[PDB]
């Protein structure tokens, strides 16, 4: 039985750990939450308190914590050999097998893959591949990237990301990015049917393409369901119409499946959910269930043939691309995910969670409860009629974070509300634990 | 395992979009599939043995086959595989690694944010420098000073920081605010000069560039102690103290890129110790885990961290796998082995021996210069010593040298400029002789 020195860990963390995505000022005064153990959907802190991992780490622990199978896979590969580069025509067996398996799993001619270590690396690779593809085609001015407001594609991709809070204070951003409106009906589609809202979004896309010039737009990048931006579930028919416009102008479609991928939405990939076939797909997170950092980009046969038609070295790559340990762990994780058909439980548990959490809509401070599969959000507002958010001085995010953690729940708490992305294995009883914790924390903060 | 070599080659050609590879050549010839490693040795799918003369990608410092790191990874994965460092969360291995790095990195370099790679680390450092100046009320201080032949990654601002134009070509526009200085490359840029005169010229160029741009607009200077991917450019004696003195004179932050040099490659634990420099920000990757698990990081001084922590706001930057518990645990075990075996010492000794033996190759008419620091070594190939002319692209010196070296059982970086070697810090005298003989034989095969 492992024993931790919580005070020592807190002191060392405050002294030496520059947390990402954290209020460092608050961290120095209050300290971190140190998690030391995990099983399934449960985690334990250094003091022995139990929490439900309602966010699956960072949308990524899809098959749950404590899977010995993945640990043994990593151990076996590391003992055999830990690192073989994919540079200079080198490769390891797990990397090759993962590439072939992903060619099978991703529908259609999405058959060529280059691996990375994260979602931001993957999106950066996809953008560069689109621009390089048009460059090889003799269209060097076709570099502009279409993205959306509230989109999140990484902080390295940072320009593609549509949340402005990530930009402030970090200096200039790479140019060539055009931001469209997010298919966010609650605030942008008031008093509209789904059809009319989709029509307006399509009109905006057409007008933007006309304004910029279709020959200057390399690609469109987007998530099937936007995740970090605020769990924006698109209206019915949005993706087919948007993809049709893009195909009309020849603009490449980059589908960001970093969060939606590998079973979160109720299917293996969100593209299946929305009947879209992208030219480029990006993935990360759930591919390994977060056990080892892994990401990747998959491209169509046409794009790959264009890239492979040049008798020159492809001048792009990250050092750990195709890491053998990551790929072996990914193969085992895919074995478990497919064998247990987790996307089915994701669909069922997500529907149950959405149904129960929608009861929170009765409360005066709950504007909207929305979700797709296991991606769920409770948007908190000061007033339902106006839809006005709580002001920054109220510190809704920190208060909700503290309340949820005190009630043994770990969920993303933001100024806009509560975001839940539990592991795909969550049972109904664990779903009830999450529901009651979220409701009680909301009552604690807002009555 | 149930793999056959031919099936692996076919599947790789069909489905693997290799990075840093001639895809046209790959489709015709297929990949070199490595399946097993121990120490400095690797084996391909057909059972042929090779010396890992590049340590993968400058990163397998303690060598292949260390069961201790595998056991650390297994233990951590069973206990908990992923705990985010976002939202004030952390795991014990991440915290312990941060404290240990605070001890190991000299001076007030005591605050760390982890990443999964070198490019992530350099992007984090650039953003941290700009954000630091922004918090200080200097939003116009965003320009980043870099050098020709510098390599800091191919993503995000790192791509701009990199000074090799071949990486830029065809990928579209890059983030603005990067200024490129001349590389301290004496062999071609400091001809007929002493080290002192060359350093004086470089200092003059840096000062005049700062004056032109305006020091108040320059957030930081980023550079490697020894440039690695750019061509193993060993700086002249006294270069780093003078450059750092100028930077401090204007208040410009110094970002030292220790992704390659870090963790014992140069003969000391970090390259900053070799060249007597104290950076405000340091970036690291590769050797920290010996490549066993993807890990990188950024370390900042107490002043920068205090400035960042003085703002009552969320720090809106981070990569998902920052501080991965398995990576940090493997890093702790790797550091245990590196410190206990004092690998920097063997790096210094073996590097000196390799440089001494390889410098003999300078007797050949096609070897322009052999240079190295620690275990970083390069043989620059030229058509003629007097002319110093590079072989033209049509000769395909890089591919020919690659094929020749692989045929002779050695894996080394072969480029149009020559041969680059970055062997595991554990390389012995006999393995060094194997590497030397293989390189000489490969050079004779291609150029006689
Ligand atoms: C000094 C340096 N910094 C950064 C990088 C990029 O690292 P990564 O591929 O992990 O992003 C490299 C690549 N070898 C490097 O040599």
Numbering used by the authors:
A (entry chain A): 3 to 158, 161 to 451
B (entry chain B): 4 to 451
Question: Can you provide the manuscript's text about this entry?
Answer:
Transaminases reversibly catalyze the transfer reaction of an amino group from an amine donor to a carbonyl acceptor, mediated by pyridoxal 5′-phosphate (PLP) as a cofactor. Based on the sequence information of Vf-ωTA, a novel thermostable (S)-specific transaminase from Thermomicrobium roseum (Tr-ωTA) was also identified that exhibits diverse substrate specificity and thermostability. Herein, we report the crystal structure of Tr-ωTA at 1.8 Å resolution to clarify the substrate recognition mechanism of (S)-enantioselective Tr-ωTA. The overall structure constitutes a homodimer, with each subunit comprising a large and a small domain.
The structure of Tr-ωTA was determined in the PMP-bound form at 1.8 Å resolution. In the crystal structure of Tr-ωTA, the cofactor molecule did not link to either the Lys289 residue or a possible substrate, suggesting that the cofactor was PMP. In our structure, PMP was observed only in subunit B. This finding raised the possibility that conformational differences might exist between the two subunits of Tr-ωTA. As a result, although the PMP molecules were discriminatorily distributed between the subunits in the crystal, this did not cause any structural differences in the dimer form. As PMP is present only in subunit B in the crystal structure, our crystal therefore likely constituted a mixture of the apo and holo forms of Tr-ωTA. Specifically, the oxygen atoms in the phosphate group of PMP are coordinated to adjacent water molecules and residues such as Gly121, Ala122, and Thr323. The nitrogen atom on the PMP ring forms a hydrogen bond with Asp260. Notably, Thr323 and Tyr324 from the other subunit contribute to the stabilization of the PMP position. For Tr-ωTA, Y154 along with L23 and F89 from the other subunit constitute the P-pocket components, whereas W61 and I263 are involved in the formation of the O-pocket. In contrast, the loop covering the active site of Tr-ωTA exhibited high B-factor values, suggesting that this loop likely manifests intrinsic flexibility.
